[PDB]
Symmetry: C3
Subunit: 141 residues, 3 copies
Amino acid sequence: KTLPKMSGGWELELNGTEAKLVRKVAGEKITVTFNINNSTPNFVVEVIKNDDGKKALVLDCHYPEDSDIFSIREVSFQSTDTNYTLNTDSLDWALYDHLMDFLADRGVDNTFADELVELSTALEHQEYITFLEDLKSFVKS
Amino acid sequence: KTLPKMSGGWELELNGTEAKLVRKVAGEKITVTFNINTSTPNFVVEVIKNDDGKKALVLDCHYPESDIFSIREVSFQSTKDTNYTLNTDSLDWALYDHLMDFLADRGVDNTFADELVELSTALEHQEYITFLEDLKSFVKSQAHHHHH
Amino acid sequence: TLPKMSGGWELELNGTEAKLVRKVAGEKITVTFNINNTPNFVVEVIKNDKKALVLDCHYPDIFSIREVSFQSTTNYTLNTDSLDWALYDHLMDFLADRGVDNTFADELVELSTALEHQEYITFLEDLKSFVKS
């Protein structure tokens, strides 16, 4: 019934299968976006600093397969469309550590990544149950 | 020359490589959309009921490699990745079969699928011939000989 | 300083997408390619007279036309393997008359490589600047 809460102070906004998590009290604009169709989802962290509202750092994260719960797959900047995107395999361990720490300082850590799996699983199930109902309502004569 | 006919009173319209077949089945509007580019295309069935024109059931179909076609996935769309899409592998056989029957009652059956292969192949050949003409017309400056 | 393209080509970069434009004798020729992972380039030819011939080129002659189509200024796209050698050669010549020849192809490799290392270096700087505290 009631969806699981995310620790660290986050506001959830739903728009169909697309969920946005916005850090409630922050010095910056931290948004985590994921989609129930696209349950370990793929999530995108968007960071907009106070200093310049023009550009945002976009970190495409995912859950690996067989210690950190998630990984940054690629990084890029986006204006608030095509932009330079760096894959993190081309980064040295020291810069990957800085990126992962940068996320942790903004509350995107292991607890958040574990909690996101629980929230995503719940949203998926909720949408799935509703879809079957709507489908029955439409197709059943 | 003349494109092959689809049984059931379907009305065809082509916009570039995208063909739409439309037919009314008891106030419900059924649209089958496919693209051009031996031609077994992937088609999308959109069902809009008279009762509510707000949403449509969208059934993504294809020809596998016995039913001639298969439903790959299903969703609702307003008449936009925000819509829940169910893959049919997660459906029980009876609901999948029910969906197949729902399509046949609206004329999207095996005969329709077989006829769509024939129409698709024809539209492909027609667009191909037209494209070569337009291409040759565009580079006509490259001719060595001139018929005078 | 980025390497120059022979023929008087105006370069513009929008993110990872570079466009080279040359105004011929009453025809506009645009070559588009991407600076982010020998690139694959797209030639767009618009005559003075509404539509444009789009030629998708790649490096296997230094380059090859992989496929052709028309676009207005969901379109039918023909692969060049289905074309006879004579018409394919007419298309190659048509490109060469508009400045898209072997020299252009070789020069585009050099420009592409330069744009890549430039964008890469700038990105790392911006990244480290953003993430540094």
